[PDB]
Amino acid sequence: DVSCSICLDAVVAAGGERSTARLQCGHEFHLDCIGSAFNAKGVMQCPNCRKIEKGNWLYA
Amino acid sequence: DVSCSICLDAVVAAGGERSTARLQCGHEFHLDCIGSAFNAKGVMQCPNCRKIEKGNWLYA
Ligand SMILES: [Zn+2]
Ligand SMILES: [Zn+2]
Ligand SMILES: [Zn+2]
Ligand SMILES: [Zn+2]
């Protein structure tokens, strides 16, 4: 089981509960946790390994 | 095969490829695709089935 380093809750792959994300570096998060973190910084930086993915993170 | 309805490219979770997301409804996207979509509306609404997840989608 993997835990989200942002909220410290378990990230669960099953359907029912909270949406999830898996970064290109392999670290996993809840979708709203990592999305809010990307929004605060404006880049897709992993809060764990600090790697920055060169995606297209847009606000609108 | 899993296709992202937003950009129509394959969603490949198990790879050093683009980051991916799985919504609570089961639908899968690229993280930047679905992140940018949620950012336009402020709501975690699946564009495929229109279900709304009551998460905390923050901009800062
Ligand atoms: Zn979390
Ligand atoms: Zn990482
Ligand atoms: Zn996409
Ligand atoms: Zn859906």
Domain ranges of chain A: 2-53
Query: Which chain B residue shows the shortest CA-CA distance from A27?
Result: B19
Q: How far apart are the first and last CA of chain B?
A: 35
Q: Which amino acid is at A25?
A: C
Ligand 1 centre to CA of B25 (Å) is 18
Structure-determination approach: X-ray
Q: Which amino acid is at B35?
A: G
CATH code of A2-53, in short, is 3.30.40.10
Q: Which amino acid is at A60?
A: A
* A:B CB pairs within 8 Å: 91
How far is A35 from B22, CA to CA, in rounded Å? 13
Please, how many CA atoms are within 13 Å of residue A28, restricted to the half-sphere of its CB?
Answer: 15
Please tell me the number of the ligand nearest to residue A4's CA. Answer: 1
* CB neighbour class for A14 (10 Å; exposed up to 12, middle 13-18, buried from 19): exposed
Choose the CATH number for B1-60 among 3.30.40.10, 2.40.10.10, 3.40.50.880, 3.40.50.2030: 3.30.40.10
What is the DSSP code (8-state) at residue A37?
H
* CB neighbour class for B16 (10 Å; exposed up to 12, middle 13-18, buried from 19): exposed
Nearest to A59 by CA among A47, A41, B48, B53: A41
Structural tokens at position B21: 């997301």
Question: How many angstroms away from the CA of B15 is the closest CA of chain A?
Answer: 7
Question: In terms of C-beta distances under 8 Å and separation of at least 24 residues, what long-range contacts does A11-19 make, across chains too?
Answer: A13/B22, A15/B24, A15/B25, A15/B26, A16/B24, A17/B24, A18/B24, A18/B53, A18/B55, A19/B21, A19/B22, A19/B23, A19/B24, A19/B44, A19/B53, A19/B55
What is the DSSP code (8-state) at residue B43?
S
Question: How many angstroms away from the CA of A5 is the closest CA of chain B?
Answer: 16
Of A21, A38, A59, the CB nearest to B20: A21
> A44 in helix, strand or coil?
strand
Whether B46 has a binding-site annotation, put simply, is yes
